[PDB]
Write a protein that binds this ligand. Structure first.
Ligand code: HEM
Ligand code: NAG
Ligand code: NAG
Ligand code: NAG
Ligand code: NAG
Ligand code: OTR
Ligand code: CA
Length: 595
């Protein structure tokens, strides 16, 4: 064991038996194993890690080390030969709104986050990766192949730093490297409220005992709130327009400002917390701030759970939904509610659903201004377009009226993500999320595509024609075998996303299984699930079900025309109704009288 820099948590905390609310960290959810699902613990390993050295090192690291007898291809080569495409025409999903993509990023962010170590690294090590493309320690650069346009204009590589892990702790037993999940595994609004005490406290409005989340003091949205700005230099949201000097938002999850629709969604969630606190106070003016914060949080946590499991999962999983996520039976305390490492790659299917543009739409759902449509890449780390240029209402309208990209075997990831991605700590709109996804797959020691096929009770192709029949695509299978030379060596991100979609869904069979299990586990294994007997009252539960994204939008913006089913492709004015024709969240059953 080399003296490599690493972060390892202790990390223990004590538990309260009677507590009616979740902890911030997610500790104490499970009584028998209180750290299960808590943040800052290892991602769970559904199958043993697969490293080149049966050790931390990742496949692709040493030149002369093969995987199953073949060299693994460069992540950027796979990306260029398989993931990329020119023509954006015909790629939109005729029956998914762009809100469908956006919820998935939201749900992803609630559940997992494996930050790189590099933030905790010496400046000489950061600059050595970028400036010289030299592989060492964490630094694991994505090298360009020879016929790559980025060679000519960017250098010999893209920088990349290995994910954080729980660092060797005694007895230096032979355990493979285990990456950290930095947020709570429970679907618990941790992206709004935080997964650590210190952040969760900074986000709160202490000053007024009304249980409010802190809001921006420097700017407002026709009176409605924005999240506070976050103080830290450098701020990537500053770097992208140094004239506008509008920093990133400060939210319960670090990645909130990564793109403008995510920030929009986080802004909707904040507002609902505050709206709930106010109305609860009215009902219960005797409740103090803590009680009002906790009861609102709890309501918002259920809201995310209902929207995800009632509205989102059925239309991702389609015909496999019932098989993996059958109706609820109550809290089972022997279920592992931890997020698996493989899930953090499975759920990147979202990436194939991101389209190349974003639109702002007026109150007649017509283009908001002369440059109302914008290219996705101009919107990475871009808070100024919100603050300065119309607020969230136009952006929300385009989440409703515009469409997600459909996954498609010869048009996988838009070039806005595949060539023009911006990352903090690098200066250029020049990165490739697909390449990064593959490198990270390796970084995490992921078993290859057949291991997971076999895990999920599915066949394991060994030849070209085997592969063709599974992918139902001769040319893609050809390109894959040319790169891999086998299917055992195909990285799970690209293998799982290549399979045609299941009926009524938007992922294939392998991903539906992987995702399927995970979500079933995080519902069944959660002591605070909204429907779990005892968490809410009977009467509370009849109000809670009524929720809808539509209602969330009406309540927290000045939009009055929304569809009933928001994840559907909805075209206005046909599929749009007056806000009034939509159910509310009835808060009466929260009035807790003396008697
Ligand atoms: C413009 C929209 C989006 C962009 C630019 C984006 C970009 C990124 C980037 C750069 C990462 C970190 C990659 C790494 O360091 O390994 C990431 C993480 C991730 N993204 Fe996205 N993403 C977007 C939306 C989505 C959507 C819609 C989904 C799925 C619905 C999704 C799923 C994920 C997952 C699962 C992770 C891994 C989180 C983890 O670290 O555990 N993302 N995204
Ligand atoms: C659109 O999708 C929903 C599932 O989200 C489905 O119920 C409906 O039939 C779909 N419409 C069409 C035309 O496929
Ligand atoms: C805290 O709430 C009070 C109203 O109760 C408000 O005037 C103040 O702006 C809030 N502070 C922050 C930082 O949101
Ligand atoms: C920067 O923001 C200002 C407004 O604050 C705007 O007029 C300008 O076009 C923006 N520039 C870029 C390069 O995005
Ligand atoms: C609880 O989960 C475990 C997982 O192995 C399973 O064996 C058992 O069927 C579950 N119990 C109930 C009552 O659902
Ligand atoms: N927070 C900055 C970083 O580039 C990032 C941004 C967005 C993500 O979804 C994941 C990671
Ligand atoms: Ca969570």
């Amino acid at each position: 064991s080399w003296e490599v820099g690493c972060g390892a948590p202790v990390p223990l905390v004590t538990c309260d038996e009677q507590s009616p609310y979740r902890t911030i960290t997610g500790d104490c959810n499970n009584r028998r194993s209180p750290a299960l699902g808590a943040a800052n613990r290892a991602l769970a390993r559904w199958l043993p890690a697969e490293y080149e050295d049966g050790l931390a090192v990742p496949f692709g690291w040493t030149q002369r080390k093969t995987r199953n007898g073949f060299r693994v291809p460069l992540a950027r080569e796979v990306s260029n030969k398989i993931v990329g495409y020119l023509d954006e025409e015909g790629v939109l999903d005729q029956n998914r709104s762009l809100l469908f993509m956006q919820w998935g990023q939201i749900v992803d962010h609630d559940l997992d986050f494996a930050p790189e170590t590099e933030l905790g690294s010496s400046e000489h090590s950061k600059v050595q990766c970028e400036e010289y493309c030299v592989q060492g320690d964490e630094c694991f650069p994505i090298m360009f192949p020879k016929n790559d346009p980025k060679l000519k204009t960017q250098g010999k590589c893209m920088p990349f730093f290995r994910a954080g892990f729980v660092c060797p702790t005694p007895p230096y037993q032979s355990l493979a490297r285990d990456q950290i999940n930095a947020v709570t595994s429970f679907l618990d609004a941790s992206l709004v409220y935080g997964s650590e005490p210190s952040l969760a406290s900074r986000l709160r409005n202490l000053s007024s005992p009304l249980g409010l989340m802190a809001v921006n003091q420097e700017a407002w949205d026709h009176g409605l709130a924005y999240p506070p700005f976050n103080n830290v230099k450098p701020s990537p949201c500053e770097f992208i327009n140094t004239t506008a000097h509008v920093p990133c938002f400060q939210a319960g999850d670090s990645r909130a400002s990564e793109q403008i629709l995510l920030a929009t969604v986080h802004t909707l969630l904040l507002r609902e917390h505050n709206r709930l606190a106010r109305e609860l106070k009215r009902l219960n003016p005797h409740w103090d701030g803590e009680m009002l914060y906790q009861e609102a949080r709890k309501i918002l946590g259920a809201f995310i759970q209902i929207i995800t499991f009632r509205d989102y999962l059925p239309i991702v999983l389609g015909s496999e939904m019932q098989k993996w996520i059958p109706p609820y039976q109550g809290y089972n305390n022997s279920v592992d509610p931890r997020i698996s490492n493989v899930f953090t790659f499975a759920f990147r299917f979202g990436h194939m659903e991101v389209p190349s543009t974003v639109s702002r739409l007026d109150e007649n759902y017509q283009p908001w201004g002369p440059e109302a449509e914008l290219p996705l890449h101009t919107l990475f780390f871009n808070t100024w377009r919100i603050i300065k240029d119309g607020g969230i209402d136009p952006l929300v309208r385009g989440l409703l009226a515009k469409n997600s990209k459909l996954m498609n075997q010869n048009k996988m990831v838009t070039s806005e993500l595949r060539n023009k991605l911006f990352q903090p700590t690098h200066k250029v709109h020049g990165f490739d999320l697909a390449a990064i996804n593959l490198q990270r797959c390796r970084d995490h020691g992921m078993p290859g595509y057949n291991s997971w096929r076999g895990f999920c009770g599915l066949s394991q192709p060994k030849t070209l024609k085997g592969l063709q029949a599974v992918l139902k695509n001769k040319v893609l299978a050809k390109k894959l075998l040319d790169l891999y030379k086998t299917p055992d060596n195909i990285d799970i991100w690209i293998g799982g996303n290549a399979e045609p979609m299941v009926e009524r869904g938007r992922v294939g069979p392998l991903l539906a299984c992987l995702l399927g299990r995970q979500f079933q586990q995080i519902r069944d294994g959660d002591r605070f699930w909204w429907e779990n007997p005892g968490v809410f009252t009977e009467k509370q539960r009849d109000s809670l079900q009524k929720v809808s994204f539509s209602r969330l939008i009406c309540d927290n913006t000045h939009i009055t025309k929304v569809p009933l089913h928001a994840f559907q492709a909805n075209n206005y004015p046909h599929d749009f109704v007056d806000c009034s024709a939509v159910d509310k969240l009835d808060l009466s059953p929260w009035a807790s009288r003396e008697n």
